[PDB]
Scaffold this active site. Structure first.
Site, PDB file in Angstrom:
ATOM      1  N   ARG C  63       7.940  -9.602 -17.684  1.00 30.85           N
ATOM      2  CA  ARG C  63       7.262 -10.394 -16.623  1.00 30.85           C
ATOM      3  C   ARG C  63       5.901 -10.936 -17.040  1.00 30.85           C
ATOM      4  NH1 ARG C  63      10.662  -6.740 -14.713  1.00 30.85           N
ATOM      5  NH2 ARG C  63      11.797  -7.197 -12.762  1.00 30.85           N
ATOM      6  N   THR C  64       5.103 -10.132 -17.733  1.00 31.25           N
ATOM      7  CA  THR C  64       3.784 -10.621 -18.189  1.00 31.25           C
ATOM      8  C   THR C  64       3.911 -11.633 -19.303  1.00 31.25           C
ATOM      9  OG1 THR C  64       2.843  -8.456 -17.715  1.00 31.25           O
ATOM     10  CG2 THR C  64       1.552  -9.864 -19.140  1.00 31.25           C
ATOM     11  N   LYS C  92       6.326  -2.469 -39.946  1.00 33.81           N
ATOM     12  CA  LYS C  92       7.098  -1.811 -41.023  1.00 33.81           C
ATOM     13  C   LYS C  92       6.061  -1.392 -42.028  1.00 33.81           C
ATOM     14  CE  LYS C  92       9.903  -5.052 -40.758  1.00 33.81           C
ATOM     15  NZ  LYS C  92      10.667  -6.338 -40.616  1.00 33.81           N
ATOM     16  N   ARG C 113       0.342  -8.083 -26.808  1.00 30.47           N
ATOM     17  CA  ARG C 113       0.535  -6.927 -26.009  1.00 30.47           C
ATOM     18  C   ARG C 113       1.046  -5.790 -26.889  1.00 30.47           C
ATOM     19  NH1 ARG C 113       1.035  -5.863 -19.906  1.00 30.47           N
ATOM     20  NH2 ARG C 113       2.014  -3.766 -20.008  1.00 30.47           N
ATOM     21  N   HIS C 141      -6.418  -4.544 -19.110  1.00 28.93           N
ATOM     22  CA  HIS C 141      -5.563  -5.648 -18.689  1.00 28.93           C
ATOM     23  C   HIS C 141      -6.470  -6.699 -18.031  1.00 28.93           C
ATOM     24  CE1 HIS C 141      -2.173  -8.024 -17.858  1.00 28.93           C
ATOM     25  NE2 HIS C 141      -1.366  -7.134 -17.303  1.00 28.93           N
TER      26      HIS C 141
END
Ligand SMILES: Oc1cc2ccccc2cc1O
Ligand SMILES: Oc1cc2ccccc2cc1O
Ligand SMILES: Oc1cc2ccccc2cc1O
Ligand code: NA
Lengths: 328, 321, 317
Positions: C63-64, C92, C113, C141
């Site tokens: 959603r964000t 990795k 994010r 946030h």
């Protein structure tokens, strides 16, 4: 004559580095240099706006996929993405030939990455639109070779002259056996007056096949001698008198046995010390990403250009797409 | 009168093929044809530029998602993608009604594919923006029907006439029970003068409610007779006097006995009419042998290409200013 | 004013809400409002056309991620998405420093994010292009705080005045302990003339260090009193005399039913009170409340489009 070259290159698929001839290579280098100037001055780069591509990446290769997407979108084009962990997860029952026949009626061109040798060649024969091979199992990664050459040529532009008195000496270091980037770039560089130092542990020696091809390509321009190809198992001898040091990746997914991977990952570590007796003009390339192959301290050494090399990829991909797909 | 029909279609959701009426069907067909001429002549197809879409795909359907994305991007619009294996991974606690209410404030329209029947209908009543259903649990796949119809109409343009003396005969072959594509196209064809051959194994027969909808739709234009729907067992009889052969996919999920029951070969085609055309919604696995691709009766790759034009047309009609 | 502010904000990374100062907050709120007018009047919004972004989401947060993509694309820009379950599958062997160094040569900005704070901080130091933090483990946030504040400011614009005689009263309800959104917005609000009611069960109390920061901030602007921070057990006391009700997500069984907002529970609130919830909701607010004019949590989500557009515009133009 960029216009004659562009008509020739329009709608070309690029699968192997041998699909690019001398004149095409000069068109690509020149066009790449224009895009570098453009981007560096924050000019408008939207030279290909009305195109839609599909990028199909059928193994984990998120860095390469993002490099192509960045170039498409910076050109002002659009891309839809197919990504899967392997090819069978995408195709399921369907043949490669059907999938490409239809996909190519949806889009103006396709970027394809698939470790299967065969799949890429099926794709090319069934597609009604140009394909760029973003890397396949059989040792061909052309856009990498092109960006490597672009990078080399920026520091040593005499590589293009084919002057019998101006030879470029390159050392390739690491996994020569499996390093696709080495195979493909060797094939390209050996079209010019170039000499090669191959540095590796015994079980990762350059294949005979590649040496045969390098030999053929140098002899064709009368640049082949007994000094053309040298083999070394240590850096101090292999790094002597070379203009370019090209460090390969050591890919963990290629060495099952984790002890072998540990042996090979630490066999050749580039440090400021191992660089002290190289030429003053030598430049260090690495296709990226690195793990332990090059110490972080080397990033401050002015000999290192491997981040500039990766940035050059944007310019060279934009150039290749523009040359193939523009309507002018 | 395209201008008057475009005002009517503007901001319309397309969930079931019954959301599209006769005149809208005509405008879709006509507009699809224009896109076909434009695209075949390598031309500028930026006919819808300033829109942003969301494509929500809550089962694996890579091909259908790429089809729609291609249409959006080719029109000159933009799209963001939500992709998940199932709808519960995406909604989690949240109601479909909350998710669509919010999503609809971010974009101009939404393409939605969800194996749940109910979800789509919840989505449409919660959305403040048009939704295109890209396939759902209740066997509605209207854009597939549209593109199928466009392809049929290309080869048998009399299907639009509702002339009592010019009947189109079609065989649907394979999984009629679970065939989303078959349900939706049958519903659309049954508004015209059409008769139907259903070829399947006992377990995969066409559902009665499709038969009801067909019968009801034919009766409504006086095209229903006791000959209107037949049911067959083998191809040789099923394929007999049909202008269109429509092969369904036979997909593993819904098998080893089913997958080999009805394979189209050049043999099974010898005693069809000269003018019959073969359609298949794709991808094909073994339902049609590769030899049939060279047989000029096969039009399934043109049919899939046509879907670009029809999806572009639909989007154009609904979303332009 | 705005070109000066834009020159200042140009090329800023936004990682924490404390990267945004008073004047930058004003430019964000002003510019957000202009994008609201433009979108609501169906006008051309392509104010950021030649830009290409990379959205890197290294935890599932669909959603964000969609909100930011919608805002990039509405601005006329393009985005390429990197979208996996954790950061180790994406890094990795490669260091976060190398990865961001290279990615920032390909694109004009990055939306990031990552639940790891270490990763976000290395990214910002290594990137040659601005990063927006789209949320992380530690509750920073910032775009959520910004859009919460925009929403509050629309109904109670006196919040920006720093007028001793116009105080805003807010209740935060639910999981104050783990509710990041609360910590961040509290820190932002405590720069203004604001009083706080924290409503929660014993075990989900607001952390003392958030109370310390709020105290410190209110003192610094001479808005602190012994009434500044009140603590409650229940809604009936908690919801009393507050201009804003902010319901948290409760993201257990016994601790997820304690404070459900209904029309009954809203009966004694102020007539002007507005109800926010960062969304999605489960059981925290009954569906009936969506019809009540006091509820604005869907307008709040919509505002997020405008606010993200604004921030993108101000940073990257
Ligand atoms: O070679 C690299 C290319 C990248 C592209 C995008 C993001 C990260 C990357 C890291 C690389 O090493
Ligand atoms: O069979 C199909 C294959 C596809 C591959 C990529 C995109 C769309 C496709 C549609 C098909 O029907
Ligand atoms: O609750 C939400 C649902 C969404 C659905 C799609 C896109 C964005 C969304 C944001 C939400 O807060
Ligand atoms: Na995209």
């Amino acid at each position: 004559d960029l216009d004659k070259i562009m008509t020739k290159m329009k709608n070309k698929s690029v699968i192997n580095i041998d699909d690019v001839d001398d004149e095409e290579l000069l068109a690509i280098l020149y066009t790449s240099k224009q895009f570098e100037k453009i981007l560096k001055n924050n000019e408008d780069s939207k030279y290909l706006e009305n195109k839609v591509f599909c990028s199909v990446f059928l193994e984990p290769s998120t860095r390469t996929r993002c490099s192509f997407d960045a170039a498409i979108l910076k050109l002002g084009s659009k891309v839809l993405n197919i990504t899967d962990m392997n090819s069978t997860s995408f195709y399921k029952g369907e043949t490669v030939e059907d999938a490409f026949k239809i996909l190519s009626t949806y889009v103006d061109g396709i970027i394809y990455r698939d470790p299967s040798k065969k799949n890429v060649d099926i794709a090319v024969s069934s597609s009604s639109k140009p394909i760029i091979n973003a890397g396949n199992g059989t040792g061909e990664h052309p856009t990498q070779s092109l960006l490597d050459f672009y990078t080399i040529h920026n520091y040593f532009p005499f590589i293009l002259d084919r002057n019998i008195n101006k030879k470029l000496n390159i050392a390739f270091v690491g996994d020569l056996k499996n390093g696709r980037t080495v195979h493909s770039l060797s094939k390209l560089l050996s079209r010019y007056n170039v000499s090669f130092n191959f540095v590796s542990c015994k079980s990762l020696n350059i294949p005979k096949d590649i040496v045969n091809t390098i030999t053929y390509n140098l002899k064709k321009n009368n640049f082949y001698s007994d000094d053309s190809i040298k083999y070394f198992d240590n850096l101090e001898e292999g790094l002597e008198d070379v203009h370019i040091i090209y460090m390969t990746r050591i890919q963990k997914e290629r060495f099952t046995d984790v002890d072998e991977y540990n042996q090979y990952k630490n066999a050749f570590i580039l440090s400021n010390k191992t660089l002290e007796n190289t030429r003053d003009d030598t430049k260090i390339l690495h296709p990226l990403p690195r793990v332990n192959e090059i110490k972080v301290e080397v990033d401050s050494n002015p000999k290192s250009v491997y981040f500039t090399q990766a940035e050059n990829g944007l310019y060279v991909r934009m150039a290749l797409l523009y040359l193939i797909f523009s309507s002018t």
